[PDB]
Write a protein that binds this ligand. Structure first.
Ligand SMILES: [Mg+2]
Lengths: 59, 286, 75, 100, 81, 40, 166, 149, 102, 140
């Protein structure tokens, strides 16, 4: 992507805030999709030893 | 007291190793160590690099002015015949001048869009004190160098290295020497970015001047991506738009840094120094 | 049942072995039929010849081809 | 009009097959962000006699309050902010290998 | 004992095994030759194979002892002049 | 993955069994001389 | 036995060049076979570690432990030894560089118990080692601040790479 | 082990083999004994093998020093400066001939665990993945549930 | 093994190729070749007249010692073995393709 | 003749050197270190099987992550790339999902396009011809 070494690393391991609307939504389905974002399972660069989790906001 | 000698002998060698760890001896030149032949090690030097060096030219490449002055001082103390050795000053200038004129030619053909100053810095990088000395110490250049102080100063090591090329210049000619520079100095910028070797200040101020020569309107900086702006870990993707056309996009922790990185992204594309550029062709010339 | 597997040369699993369709051989197969897979041998090009010994190949369908060229069909 | 995937976010995938059918060709040019989908950067952020000299605002904080501030500004727990003993501080490699 | 229950794939695995064995019963119902035709059709090869076993079994003997091997041990003290 | 499908296509369930992926020589000289056959 | 600490005052360094900086003075001193526990001596040795020469004496002068007087006597003669033999200008320009206690050669006696039982008690001895360095005591390390914590945490997230891949 | 030993990433010296191949072996020193069964195999290597071996590797300077010793040794020095010393005490000529050949191929780097069986300085050509790679852009770049003007 | 390689990179092979160091070879099996804008797929392999991958042998050396130990409690069962498998290092020199799609 | 062991120091230094990085008395006492170095080596031998198991499971999760970004599931991607005669292992696909996002999207489209062809064939009764990407190259 022709980025410099530091910004390229920073962008890949960045934290992204996600929003969920809990109105008329089962808690488990809300929890299932929030769990993967918290663990970082939605990223191809996911690894347990790397703190690649994201922020989940549920209203 | 247990009778035996093998265990006691083996224990003595182990103690010496520990003593060496506690008190490491000062480094000494490879010549002073046993199993050294000045005439033999310099002949294998050509065969190792697969070149037809000339012994008379190659021997004068490792001789330094500091060594000559120090050697004369030793004989004066002992009252000791005259030495006709020639320094590498004449050869180093020939090697240095040819190397820059050959490196400039290679880069000006691979990257025709790069300005003269940009190519000038890259030649100043490959011929730099760090790159040249790193290559020299892995080609047995420091071992064969006749210096006054050990370890050889990096300034002295750089000057001796171009003397070896200078000797190769007369020995095999410029066509064969051009392969020597390509296979040892060009290979020193494989996984390195453009600005990692050509360090600049204010890339945005340099990006504007490049678009003025090409009659391109000034880019506009706008936020394309954003995450965690209010927190301590923000991410911004600032995009440069020339006439409402995206030319580059760069990330950063803050908007000013992300703006700066976007300019560096644009400059690489203008000079053709992107990461996706085709690798240098090391195949034999046709 | 362990002995009969050794008799038939079926020690290693997932390794094809050819036997004759005769009552004596089938008698041993009727005892360990729950441990083996029985498939008839197919010969689209016929029995292998002396010039085809180095070019034979058994496919999973039971067909023993005598010309294993490793090349896509031009058709 | 048919498209296996929406060609809006990453690139334009164009699947194709060769005449002999022995090679699958994929042409995927990169898509650029439109000018209308961006936001302008927020560049902006008297009778004075005495110059506003640089005044230090380094407030003293104990072990307790300092960690709670750190654990909230980084959304972490208190445990990672405590120091470690000499045994763990000496096992760490100060010259680790580097790749790329 | 703790009860154990059969899941969906457990039945599918058992049915898959049953399909293979039902096909094995088919191929064993069509002998190429009968009992009378088969008899004695391999007596020559079977007899010859066992005679090879006897040959290897009755050929067991100590290996030949050479005089070159004994004299080669004098080389352990070989040195330069 | 895909073992049952390959059997219906006349191929091996394991792609390493037989075919151009496995049977063909893995390398050859730059000049063009064929490589010696692999041990497998 | 080992007596290497006394020989550390006999090493003579080569003369310094005019451009070379001033070399601080090092004084090694010790007292052997002190009738005191090496464990209890450590607390007195731990206390004065890093203190100035005069500050250490003040803390030991009003301490109730027996070894406090012994340590002070060692510091007094080491301060005298520094000026007299180690060429130290100001006797107050010293600080405790190294100060620890070592186990000494201990005797064994029999301690009587009831029911004809007995135990083996040891008359414990210990050593004291002290090193003095000319110059003011080094400033203590300031406690780590939140700015340093933030700088460390961010640097941790900048050094992480994609593992188990290309 | 792995935990108890150091490790390094796969690499070469000055990118050997990129433009031209340079043999990393630089020097071989043999210490054999005229008398002694320990060097019987080593002396036979010097009589017939070292002369032919030196032809194949012209860039390697070979020293054969004959001195009294109980354990013959061979010292190998490489261009990067690493020195590897091995003992040929009581070995056949076949073992010594194959052992010297292995020392010729090595690059001199330490024989420890290698973390990756591959190494590339340009692992990405289409752009390394970032979380915004597969996210569509919205009109005016508005945030979720954000009202403008 | 399938290697996602590009130009001027290194690969480590866990067996001997019986090739002298410095010899240049060609890798016949290529399953996928990609560029910045276009991508070609083999079914399952590309033709040899379409993609040419060439590598160079740069080092032949043995592996670091591997510990192979087995233990069984209360049986006096214990044995340790050390193995050093041979290894080979190849450097990909160039990857060029030919316009033979049509 | 009376024989006594003179090199017993070296017989224990070859076991204590493998315990230098441990914690507690079991890094310098031979009686304790010998029972710990054995388990350290036993685990080292058995860990070679779990490393291969963990690497593949890591690849499966990483592939599944990139499949959802393109609206695909792991069974749909791996299962349908085989039917296109594209034999790519998990290691390459996971590396493609990280460093070659545009190439992985093309493979996602190919799996998605081939997935739809099978649905069309399941609706028909064989009269309709096979899909363009459903043709199988035969090797003889
Ligand atoms: Mg009594």
């Amino acid at each position: 992507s022709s980025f410099s070494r530091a910004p390229q690393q920073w962008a890949t391991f960045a934290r992204i805030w996600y929003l969920l609307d809990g109105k008329m939504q089962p808690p488990g389905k809300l929890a299932a999709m929030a769990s993967i974002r918290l663990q970082g399972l939605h990223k191809p660069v996911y690894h347990a030893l790397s703190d690649c989790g994201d922020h989940v906001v549920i209203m | 007291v247990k009778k035996g000698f093998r265990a006691a002998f083996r224990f003595q060698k182990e103690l010496e190793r520990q003593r060496l760890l506690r008190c490491p001896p000062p480094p000494v030149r490879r010549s002073e160590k046993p199993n050294w032949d000045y005439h033999a090690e310099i002949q294998a030097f050509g065969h190792r690099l697969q070149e037809n060096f000339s012994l008379d030219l190659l021997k004068t490449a490792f001789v330094n002015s500091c060594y000559i002055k120090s050697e004369e001082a030793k004989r004066q103390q002992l009252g000791i015949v005259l030495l006709n050795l020639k320094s590498n000053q004449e050869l180093s200038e020939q090697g240095t001048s040819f190397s820059q004129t050959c490196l400039t030619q290679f880069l000006e053909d691979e990257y025709p869009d790069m300005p003269t100053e940009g190519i000038k810095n890259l030649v100043d990088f490959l011929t730099g004190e760090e790159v040249v000395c790193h290559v020299a110490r892995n080609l047995a250049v420091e071992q064969l160098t006749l210096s006054e102080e050990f370890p050889v100063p990096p300034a002295v090591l750089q000057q001796t290295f171009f003397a070896v090329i200078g000797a190769l210049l007369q020995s095999s000619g410029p066509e064969r020497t051009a392969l020597f520079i390509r296979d040892f100095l060009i290979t020193q910028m494989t996984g390195k970015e453009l600005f990692e070797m050509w360090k600049i200040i204010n890339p945005m101020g340099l990006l504007v001047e490049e678009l003025k020569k090409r009659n391109v309107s000034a880019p506009e900086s706008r936020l394309t991506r954003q995450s965690g702006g209010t927190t301590a870990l923000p991410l911004y993707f600032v995009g440069l738009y020339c006439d409402k056309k995206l030319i580059a996009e760069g990330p950063g922790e803050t908007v000013l840094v992300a703006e700066e990185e976007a300019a560096r992204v644009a400059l690489r594309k203008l000079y053709g120094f992107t990461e996706n550029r085709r690798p240098w062709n090391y195949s034999k010339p046709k | 049942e362990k002995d009969i597997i050794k008799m038939l040369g079926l020690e290693k699993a997932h390794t094809p072995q050819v036997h004759k369709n005769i009552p004596s051989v089938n008698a041993k197969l009727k005892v360990v039929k729950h441990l083996i897979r029985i498939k008839p041998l197919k010969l689209p090009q016929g029995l292998p010849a002396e010039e085809n010994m180095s070019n034979t190949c058994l496919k999973s369908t039971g067909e023993l081809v005598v010309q294993w060229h490793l090349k896509p069909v031009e058709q | 009009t048919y498209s296996p995937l929406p060609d809006d976010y990453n690139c334009n995938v164009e699947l194709a097959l060769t005449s002999d059918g022995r090679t699958i060709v994929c042409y995927h040019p990169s898509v650029d962000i439109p000018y209308e989908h961006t936001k302008p950067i927020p560049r902006p952020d008297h009778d004075q006699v005495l110059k506003t000299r640089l005044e230090e605002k380094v407030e003293h904080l104990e072990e307790g309050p300092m960690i709670e501030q750190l654990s909230k500004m980084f959304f972490t727990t208190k445990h990672r902010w405590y120091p470690h003993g000499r045994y763990h501080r000496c096992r760490k490699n100060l010259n680790p290998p580097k790749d790329r | 004992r703790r009860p154990r229950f059969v899941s969906l794939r457990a039945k599918q695995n058992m049915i898959r095994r049953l399909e293979i064995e039902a096909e094995n019963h088919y191929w064993l119902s069509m002998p190429y030759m009968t009992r009378e035709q088969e008899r004695g059709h391999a007596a020559v090869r079977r007899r010859e194979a066992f005679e090879a076993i006897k040959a290897a079994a009755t050929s067991k003997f100590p290996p030949h002892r050479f005089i070159a091997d004994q004299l080669d041990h004098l080389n352990v003290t070989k040195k330069w002049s | 993955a895909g073992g049952q499908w390959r059997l219906q296509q006349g191929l091996a369930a394991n792609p390493s069994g037989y075919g151009p992926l496995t049977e063909l020589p893995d390398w050859s000289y730059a000049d063009g001389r064929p490589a010696p056959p692999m041990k497998g | 036995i080992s007596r290497k600490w006394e020989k550390k005052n006999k090493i003579v360094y080569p003369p310094q060049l005019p451009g070379e900086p001033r070399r601080p003075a090092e004084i090694y001193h010790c007292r052997r076979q002190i009738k005191y526990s090496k464990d209890k001596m450590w607390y007195l040795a731990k206390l004065i570690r890093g203190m100035s020469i005069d500050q250490a004496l003040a803390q030991l002068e009003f301490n109730d432990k027996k070894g406090a007087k012994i340590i002070k006597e060692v510091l007094l003669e080491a301060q005298d030894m520094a000026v007299r033999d180690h060429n130290v200008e100001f006797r107050s320009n010293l600080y405790i560089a190294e100060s620890t206690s070592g186990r000494g050669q201990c005797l064994k006696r029999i301690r009587y118990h009831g029911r004809g039982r007995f135990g083996i008690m040891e008359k414990v001895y210990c050593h004291y080692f002290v090193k003095l360095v000319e110059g003011p005591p080094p400033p203590p390390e300031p406690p780590k601040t939140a700015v340093a914590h933030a700088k460390e945490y961010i640097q941790q997230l900048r050094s992480r790479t994609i593992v188990h891949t290309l | 082990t792995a935990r108890g030993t150091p490790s390094r990433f796969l690499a070469s010296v000055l990118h050997n083999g990129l433009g031209r191949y340079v043999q990393q072996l630089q020097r071989l020193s043999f210490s054999v004994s005229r008398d002694g069964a320990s060097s019987r195999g080593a002396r036979e290597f010097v009589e017939r093998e070292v002369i032919d071996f030196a032809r194949r590797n012209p860039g390697v300077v070979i020293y054969v020093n004959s001195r009294p010793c109980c354990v013959p040794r061979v010292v190998a020095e490489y261009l990067n400066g690493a020195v590897r010393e091995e003992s040929i005490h009581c070995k056949s000529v076949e073992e010594i001939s194959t052992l010297v050949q292995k020392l010729a191929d090595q690059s001199g780097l330490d024989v420890i665990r290698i973390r990756k069986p591959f190494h590339t300085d340009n692992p990405s050509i289409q752009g390394q993945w970032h979380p915004f790679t597969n996210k569509p852009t919205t009109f005016r770049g508005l945030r979720p549930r954000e009202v403008q003007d | 093994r399938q290697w996602k390689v590009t130009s001027e990179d290194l690969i480590l092979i866990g067996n001997e190729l019986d090739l002298a160091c410095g010899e240049r070879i060609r890798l016949e099996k290529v399953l996928l070749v990609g560029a910045d804008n276009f991508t070609l797929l083999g079914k399952p392999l590309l033709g040899k007249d379409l993609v040419r991958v060439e590598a160079t042998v740069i080092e032949k050396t043995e592996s670091w010692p591997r510990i192979i130990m087995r233990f069984r409690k209360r049986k006096n069962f214990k044995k340790k073995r050390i193995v050093t498998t041979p290894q080979t290092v190849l450097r990909i020199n160039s990857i060029e393709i030919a316009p033979c799609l049509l | 003749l009376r024989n006594r062991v003179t090199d017993r120091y070296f017989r224990i230094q070859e076991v204590l050197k493998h315990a230098r990085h441990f914690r507690g008395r079991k890094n310098r006492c031979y009686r304790l270190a010998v029972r710990t170095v054995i388990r350290a080596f036993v685990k080292c031998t058995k860990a070679r099987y779990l490393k291969k198991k963990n690497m593949r499971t890591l690849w499966i999760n990483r592939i599944t992550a990139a499949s959802q970004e393109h609206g695909l599931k792991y069974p749909a991607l791996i299962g349908n790339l085989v039917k296109c005669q594209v034999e790519l292992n998990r290691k390459v696909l996971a590396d493609l999902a990280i460093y070659e996002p545009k190439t992985f999207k093309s493979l996602a489209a190919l799996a998605s396009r081939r997935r739809h062809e099978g649905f069309a064939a399941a609706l028909g009764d064989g009269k309709e011809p096979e899909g363009i990407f459903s043709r199988v190259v035969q090797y003889h």
